[PDB]
């Protein structure tokens, strides 16, 4: 196989983003102290791309992305790194390498005392 590079960008309107997100309660995750939440996003049949947006309250969080081919095979789309997504909205896109499941890693494992509040959206498009 061969993998396309992802595209990632930030945008300034964090309060608005969070308010919009908060109009749905299943779009808000609490990542415990020292814990890692994995969001599994299967590839849509009607789409060729994954799109993600996310933000946090008052503290950074590690974010990264893997692709699980459908024991299994994993490719590293985005490396896990701490992002200041408490200050800006973080977002990105990746072209489907094929049929499979995307793994969004929200990684709080380095945080002893602080939970993290994660606001996120995932999309597909052609």
């Amino acid at each position: 196989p061969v993998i396309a590079a992802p595209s990632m960008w930030t945008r300034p309107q964090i309060r608005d983003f969070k308010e919009k997100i908060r109009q749905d309660s299943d779009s808000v995750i609490t990542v415990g102290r020292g814990e890692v939440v994995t969001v599994r996003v299967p590839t849509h049949e009607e789409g060729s791309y994954l799109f993600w947006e996310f933000a946090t309250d008052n503290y950074d969080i590690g974010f990264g992305v893997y692709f699980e081919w459908t024991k299994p095979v994993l490719d590293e789309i985005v490396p896990v790194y701490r992002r200041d997504c408490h200050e800006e909205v973080y977002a990105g896109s990746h072209q489907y390498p094929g049929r499979g499941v995307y793994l969004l890693k929200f990684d709080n494992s380095y945080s002893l005392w602080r939970s993290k509040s994660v606001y996120y959206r995932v999309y597909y498009t052609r």
Partner: peptide
């Protein structure tokens, strides 16, 4: 170790508007 399953939603012209507004790139 928690694992959530999300079904992605079709990206819309509206969604895409906001996302693009005052966008700044990023590298890793």
């Amino acid at each position: 170790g928690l694992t959530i399953e999300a079904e992605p939603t079709e990206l819309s012209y509206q969604d895409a508007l906001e996302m693009l507004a005052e966008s700044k790139p990023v590298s890793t």
